[PDB]
């Protein structure tokens, strides 16, 4: 139960269906599959999304466990069924990180979902495929252009150029090497201003990374630090 996310209590389900996360898009959903090497029984439903691939039970759906695209390495098919009551059904499981293996056997689907496999190749693929002009992500735009910022690293600080985007909040330095320093907004948890410490700066409280990245704005009369904290606390 190390990559089974909890659903009965942590997703607060009824007796029949899952609970959808914000921004989670559904494509297909089916039934009558077997799980092995979890902590479960023998039969239940099967749901899929753009962030999780979900097994709903049949008997006791107050035990219902799944995993998503954050942990899957690659996926397999069996073959196209040659003749006389075969199937195309194969769900075989490659964990990215841990040594747990799984086999998903649809117990009684009659064509075994040959067209759901035509979908599931692309939805893993989207999670696969993910001078100062930004390497811009799709569904992302630039909302501020700031020249002359002294980001002060643990090594040293230098002349730089800052951008404020929708998601990937990056910083460029034009000091002889074209640095890449980029954080996403979802890794940002909280923000504080440091006017006195290190000269009119902001510090970044990261949850997962557990580190702090600063910038620098005492280098010019800038009138943009109060512009900054509004955009980044909102978005």
Residue numbers in the entry: 5 to 134, 149 to 253
Show sentences the authors wrote.
The BBSome is a cargo adaptor that recognizes a diverse set of membrane-bound ciliary proteins. Here we report the structure of the human BBSome core complex at an average resolution of 3.8 Å for BBS1, 4, 8, 9, and 18 and 4.3 Å for BBS5.
In addition, the resolution is limited in this region, indicating a high degree of conformational flexibility. After three-dimensional sorting we also resolved BBS5 at a resolution of 4.3 Å and combined its density with the reconstruction of the full data set to build an atomic model. BBS5 is composed of two PH domains that both interact with the β-propeller of BBS9. One of the PH domains also interacts with BBS8 and with an unstructured loop of BBS9. Like PH-GRAM and GLUE, BBS5 was shown to bind phosphoinositides, with the highest preference for phosphatidylinositol 3-phosphate (PI(3)P) and phosphatidic acid (PA), which was suggested to be crucial for ciliogenesis. Besides BBS1 that indirectly interacts with membranes via Arl6, BBS5 likely mediates the contact to membranes by direct interactions with phosphoinositides.
